[PDB]
């Protein structure tokens, strides 16, 4: 299956191409235009149909976002979006097809089609809510420790010091993405 986007947004497609490949594990191909004055370009996505559907929605949303806005949360939750070299952000982008850009600590720019923005907002809200489910280092799930073994990671500490409820949701997100 193929689909079209604005020719004026080809620049965007190419900037994001590697991230799209990494996140959805797909190939992005742009077809040559049949005429120069064409307002659209056709894309073809290479990979499993699941991966491709999600990439499609990401790319549509990237090229002309139906929603673009900052979500706001406790600054101490910001490590989740920067830690493990962006692994969690990637898993969240996978699960929602939203384009996600960390801003100030406690601020995340979410962007894409509307159903993608709301589902990402929702998931980010849930994480934030679960920070309040602290009932106090202070405890770590084995499987969570397991993902964060990459020693250089500068947000490794902050992540480990997250309460177990946030850790469990992050596991659930990673599990969803694999």
Numbering used by the authors: 12 to 147, 157 to 198
According to the publication:
The asymmetric unit contains two copies of the ex-diKH domain. In each copy, the domain spans residues 12 to 198 and is composed of an N-terminal type 1 KH module (KH1, residues 12–74), a short linker (residues 75 and 76), a second type 1 KH module (KH2, residues 77–144), a longer linker (residues 145–161) and a C-terminal bundle (CTB) extension composed of three alpha helices (residues 162–198). The KH2 domain has the expected β1-α1-α2-β2-β3-α3 type 1 KH topology but in KH1 α1 and α2 are near continuous constituting α1′ that contains a pronounced proline kink surrounding P29. Inspection of the domain packing within the protein revealed a substantial interdomain interface that packs KH1 onto KH2. At the center of the interface, these include hydrophobic packing of KH1 side chains I34, F35, Y69, and L73 with A104, H110, L124, and A127 of KH2. These are accompanied by surrounding salt bridges and hydrogen bonding between R33 and D101, R65 and the mainchain carbonyl of S106 and between Y69 and H110, with R33 also π-stacking with W105. Additionally, the CTB extension packs onto the KH2 domain making an interface stabilized by multiple interactions between CTB α8 and KH2 α5, including a salt bridge network between E196 and R134, R134 and E189 and R141, as well as hydrogen bonding between R141 and the carbonyl of the mainchain A185. The computed Complex Formation Significance Score of 0.0 also suggested that the interface is unlikely to have biological relevance. This conclusion is supported by solution size-exclusion chromatography coupled to multiangle laser light scattering (SEC-MALLS) data that revealed that the ex-diKH domain was exclusively monomeric over the range of concentrations tested (0.5–8 mg/ml). Therefore, the dimer observed in the crystal likely is a result of crystal packing rather than any residual assembly associated with an ex-diKH domain homo-oligomerization function. Further analysis of the interresidue contacts in the ex-diKH crystal structure identified exposed arginine residues, R33 and R65, that make salt bridges and cation–π stacking interactions at the edge of the KH1-KH2 cleft that potentially could form part of a protein binding site.
